[PDB]
Design a protein around this ligand. Structure first.
Ligand SMILES: NC[C@@H]1O[C@H](O[C@H]2[C@@H](O)[C@H](O[C@@H]3[C@@H](O)[C@H](N)C[C@H](N)[C@H]3O[C@H]3O[C@H](CO)[C@@H](O)[C@H](O)[C@H]3N)O[C@@H]2CO)[C@H](N)[C@@H](O)[C@@H]1O
Ligand SMILES: NC[C@@H]1O[C@H](O[C@H]2[C@@H](O)[C@H](O[C@@H]3[C@@H](O)[C@H](N)C[C@H](N)[C@H]3O[C@H]3O[C@H](CO)[C@@H](O)[C@H](O)[C@H]3N)O[C@@H]2CO)[C@H](N)[C@@H](O)[C@@H]1O
Ligand SMILES: NC[C@@H]1O[C@H](O[C@H]2[C@@H](O)[C@H](O[C@@H]3[C@@H](O)[C@H](N)C[C@H](N)[C@H]3O[C@H]3O[C@H](CO)[C@@H](O)[C@H](O)[C@H]3N)O[C@@H]2CO)[C@H](N)[C@@H](O)[C@@H]1O
Ligand SMILES: NC[C@@H]1O[C@H](O[C@H]2[C@@H](O)[C@H](O[C@@H]3[C@@H](O)[C@H](N)C[C@H](N)[C@H]3O[C@H]3O[C@H](CO)[C@@H](O)[C@H](O)[C@H]3N)O[C@@H]2CO)[C@H](N)[C@@H](O)[C@@H]1O
Ligand SMILES: [Mg+2]
Ligand SMILES: [Mg+2]
Ligand SMILES: [Mg+2]
Ligand SMILES: [Mg+2]
Ligand SMILES: [Mg+2]
Ligand SMILES: [Mg+2]
Ligand SMILES: [Mg+2]
Ligand SMILES: [Mg+2]
Ligand SMILES: [Mg+2]
Ligand SMILES: [Mg+2]
Ligand SMILES: [Mg+2]
Ligand SMILES: [Mg+2]
Ligand SMILES: [Mg+2]
Ligand SMILES: [Mg+2]
Ligand SMILES: [Mg+2]
Ligand SMILES: [Mg+2]
Ligand SMILES: [Mg+2]
Ligand SMILES: [Mg+2]
Ligand SMILES: [Mg+2]
Ligand SMILES: [Mg+2]
Ligand SMILES: [Mg+2]
Ligand SMILES: [Mg+2]
Ligand SMILES: [Mg+2]
Ligand SMILES: [Mg+2]
Ligand SMILES: [Mg+2]
Ligand SMILES: [Mg+2]
Ligand SMILES: [Mg+2]
Ligand SMILES: [Mg+2]
Ligand SMILES: [Mg+2]
Ligand SMILES: [Mg+2]
Ligand SMILES: [Mg+2]
Ligand SMILES: [Mg+2]
Ligand SMILES: [Mg+2]
Ligand SMILES: [Mg+2]
Ligand SMILES: [Mg+2]
Ligand SMILES: [Mg+2]
Ligand SMILES: [Mg+2]
Ligand SMILES: [Mg+2]
Ligand SMILES: [Mg+2]
Ligand SMILES: [Mg+2]
Ligand SMILES: [Mg+2]
Ligand SMILES: [Mg+2]
Ligand SMILES: [Mg+2]
Ligand SMILES: [Mg+2]
Ligand SMILES: [Mg+2]
Ligand SMILES: [Mg+2]
Ligand SMILES: [Mg+2]
Ligand SMILES: [Mg+2]
Ligand SMILES: [Mg+2]
Ligand SMILES: [Mg+2]
Ligand SMILES: [Mg+2]
Ligand SMILES: [Mg+2]
Ligand SMILES: [Mg+2]
Ligand SMILES: [Mg+2]
Lengths: 88, 119, 73, 101
RNA sequence: GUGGGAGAGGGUGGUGGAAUUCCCGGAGUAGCGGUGAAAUGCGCAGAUACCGGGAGGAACGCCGAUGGCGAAGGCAGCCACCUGGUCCACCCGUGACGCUGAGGCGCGAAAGCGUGGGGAGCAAACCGGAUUAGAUACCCGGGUAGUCCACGCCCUAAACGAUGCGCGCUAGGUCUCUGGGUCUCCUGGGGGCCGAAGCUAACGCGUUAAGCGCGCCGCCUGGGGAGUACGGCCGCAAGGC
């Protein structure tokens, strides 16, 4: 599904400073990944609801984090969005 | 008029009737009996008595084909399954073995209401 | 009843994921085809649970019987 | 790329040519669904607990392979296409788990 | 984050044997079935019982539990793919990013609806046989929807722990599932049981609180009229809010 490698790419990509595991950036990138993987799963298997719950919870966590970013740093936020192709 | 002499005896048991079929070693029936074979009509066919009788008859008719050795299959849980066994045991026929074959599903079909509270 | 023989004391170390091993798995089926209870295997919760699956794989391949006729009775 | 185990039980009745033909079609199969063969056991004729295809015995092989997951099912589908093949069972390889140790 | 663990959590595809019914063939003959007792029913066009072959539907025995998973409804043969939640150790990274949550959106047993499909077993209605004072029933023989599949509606319930969510504080003993460690023991997550304090009208609850506390939502205000009337909203309808 998501390899220790795919993950490594995305973290070493989004980390503030090397070795940054859990910064707001990174978390939001892992999330986005998991979410797109999952919504892709759910364009087929539109009958699999219990997973879709996972999805809503996931988007909840994402938005939470972002509105926190917007709060603390409107820059890191705007940048990470455009880079991640969100806002929708 | 085969002259078999070595064969199979099938006892089938209900809370309704008991019925004994006897075959050759290949499963092909030679002679048989049941509770209604003897004069019993109503419920009486499920009696251990009725069973003993059907057993005995089936075996006697089977001596007429000259049978001696028989291996015994039993299906169904019934009154008089065991009296039919015991009957055959000395009918003068020699019972070489007995087996319980009573068929049980892995939950195939919703039984009638009569049999439910289980599947 | 069932305090007489526990199938765990029967052999020592044996692979419980091994569905190809007839004579060992076959140690867990009753006189009929039935997979024995935790009682008479004396397995652990999980051991038992694993036995279940490996025995069903064995069944499906044709190694272990699904149901067997009862002798005597 | 994961490790699986491919169980195949085919006709007790095959002679040398027919069987080494089946095995050949199996090789071709695995290969063309993308499986590398790590070890193999041909246990051959063995005695079935219940009759399969009216034959009381079966010819057993087992192959431990590495293949791409995404095609695994189709592979089995192919292995099963063959007439002479009466069982196919693919397992994801699991590490041995032993009681009494 | 990293590294490990358990699971009927979900979607799709494949697939195994048991059983029933049906068909084909063999052997076989006077009844089978069913009940309190019986009749209707099935059988001489050969039934039941028995052996061999085939077709199809539905459901997965043992394991299985005092068990596990899930927000809930709910989830059980086996295989693979896809996928959600969860837990433990490391104490690595973020730095209050938290809690609840009117409305909204999503799900939501069963029954029920629309289009097809499938239809073995069961079975409302229905057709019979019995029973009874009658018997629009309990019993018996049949049978249609349905139950099954896809897609779309329906939104209900003793939808129950009749117990909203989160966090903190308050003796213990024992059983169990499942992780971890220096593995007589210790330590973390879950399911039971008995009990300190305490609470409760009582029953009883008691670290899985119904105790002691804070936050936030929902809800109650004597019984019947009544989940009715009216209006609105939803629905193909049945109907729901
Ligand atoms: N394992 C198959 C499963 O099929 C499910 O549903 C499937 C089946 O239930 C349904 O009907 C199938 C079909 O092949 C065909 N029309 C008839 C066939 N008998 C059915 O398959 C059957 O299998 C078992 C017995 O093995 C039955 O108990 C059950 O009624 C049915 N699933 O059609 C669906 C697809 O063919 C789910 N999609 C999923 O869980 C999974 O793919
Ligand atoms: N996929 C179709 C499903 O069919 C279901 O049909 C179910 C119902 O007919 C019936 O439910 C009964 C229930 O009365 C009772 N309270 C419990 C009982 N164990 C259940 O029965 C079930 O038990 C298990 C399930 O794993 C099986 O072993 C067994 O075959 C099955 N009959 O068993 C069936 C098996 O699920 C339901 N409609 C729903 O689950 C779903 O629509
Ligand atoms: N789903 C039930 C079964 O679980 C077994 O294996 C499953 C579990 O043992 C295993 O759990 C792993 C866990 O070990 C590991 N340490 C972490 C991982 N997150 C977990 O997986 C879990 O979470 C992830 C998302 O994070 C989901 O994608 C996945 O569905 C879920 N099982 O994940 C597997 C798949 O879910 C069976 N072998 C498999 O066939 C089947 O999926
Ligand atoms: N094996 C016989 C079967 O007969 C079936 O017969 C079915 C159809 O003739 C009939 O459905 C018709 C529909 O075709 C027509 N276009 C309009 C009509 N108003 C429907 O009427 C039906 O609707 C429901 C299902 O929604 C049925 O269950 C019910 O019998 C009937 N009210 O309902 C019947 C019961 O299912 C089907 N041909 C098929 O399942 C199968 O061949
Ligand atoms: Mg959370
Ligand atoms: Mg705020
Ligand atoms: Mg600021
Ligand atoms: Mg009778
Ligand atoms: Mg599951
Ligand atoms: Mg397969
Ligand atoms: Mg069959
Ligand atoms: Mg015939
Ligand atoms: Mg007639
Ligand atoms: Mg007549
Ligand atoms: Mg024959
Ligand atoms: Mg047959
Ligand atoms: Mg007990
Ligand atoms: Mg106990
Ligand atoms: Mg729970
Ligand atoms: Mg429940
Ligand atoms: Mg730290
Ligand atoms: Mg931590
Ligand atoms: Mg700091
Ligand atoms: Mg602040
Ligand atoms: Mg919330
Ligand atoms: Mg619903
Ligand atoms: Mg329904
Ligand atoms: Mg319908
Ligand atoms: Mg019809
Ligand atoms: Mg019926
Ligand atoms: Mg009826
Ligand atoms: Mg009537
Ligand atoms: Mg009348
Ligand atoms: Mg009346
Ligand atoms: Mg009639
Ligand atoms: Mg609604
Ligand atoms: Mg609502
Ligand atoms: Mg409780
Ligand atoms: Mg509870
Ligand atoms: Mg609970
Ligand atoms: Mg509730
Ligand atoms: Mg929460
Ligand atoms: Mg405790
Ligand atoms: Mg105890
Ligand atoms: Mg106890
Ligand atoms: Mg340990
Ligand atoms: Mg506890
Ligand atoms: Mg529970
Ligand atoms: Mg108590
Ligand atoms: Mg007190
Ligand atoms: Mg008191
Ligand atoms: Mg109170
Ligand atoms: Mg109210
Ligand atoms: Mg209200
Ligand atoms: Mg009033
Ligand atoms: Mg109402
Ligand atoms: Mg109105
Ligand atoms: Mg309207």
């Amino acid at each position: 599904p998501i390899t220790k490698e795919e993950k490594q790419k995305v973290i070493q990509e989004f980390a503030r400073f090397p070795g940054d595991t859990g910064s707001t950036e990174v978390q939001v990138a892992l999330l986005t990944l998991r979410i797109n993987r999952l919504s892709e799963h759910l364009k087929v298997h539109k009958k699999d609801h219990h997973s879709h719950r996972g999805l809503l919870m996931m988007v909840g966590q994402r938005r939470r984090l972002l509105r926190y970013l917007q709060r603390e740093d409107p820059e890191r936020y705007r940048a990470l969005i455009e880079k991640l192709g969100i806002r929708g | 008029k085969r002259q078999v002499a070595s064969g199979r005896a099938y006892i089938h048991a209900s809370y309704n009737n008991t019925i004994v079929t006897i075959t050759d070693p290949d499963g092909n029936p030679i002679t048989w009996s049941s509770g209604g074979v003897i004069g019993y009509k109503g419920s009486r066919k499920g009696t251990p008595y009725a069973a003993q009788l059907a057993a005995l008859d089936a075996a006697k008719k089977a001596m007429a084909y000259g049978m001696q050795s028989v291996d015994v299959i039993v299906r169904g849980t019934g009154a008089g399954r065991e009296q039919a066994i015991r009957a055959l045991q000395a009918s003068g026929l020699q019972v070489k073995s007995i087996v319980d074959d009573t068929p049980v599903p892995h939950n195939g079909c919703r039984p009638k209401k009569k049999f439910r509270k289980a599947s | 009843p069932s305090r007489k023989a526990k199938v765990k004391a029967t052999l020592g170390e044996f692979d419980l994921r091994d569905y190809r091993n007839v004579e060992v798995l076959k140690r867990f089926l009753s006189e009929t085809g039935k997979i024995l209870p935790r009682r008479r295997t004396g397995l652990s919760a999980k051991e038992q649970r694993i036995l279940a699956k490996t025995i069903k794989r064995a069944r499906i391949l044709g190694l272990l019987p699904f149901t067997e006729k009862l002798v005597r009775k | 790329m994961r490790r699986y185990e491919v169980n195949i039980v085919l006709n007790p009745n095959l002679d040398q040519s027919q069987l080494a033909l089946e095995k050949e079609i199996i090789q071709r199969a695995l290969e063309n669904y993308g499986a590398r063969v790590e070890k193999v056991e041909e246990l051959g004729l063995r005695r079935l607990a219940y009759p399969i295809a009216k034959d009381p015995q079966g010819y057993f092989l087992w192959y431990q392979v590495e293949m791409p997951e995404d095609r695994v099912n189709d592979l089995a589908r192919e292995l099963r296409i063959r007439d002479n093949v009466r069982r196919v069972m693919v397992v994801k390889s699991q590490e041995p788990f032993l009681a009494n140790a």
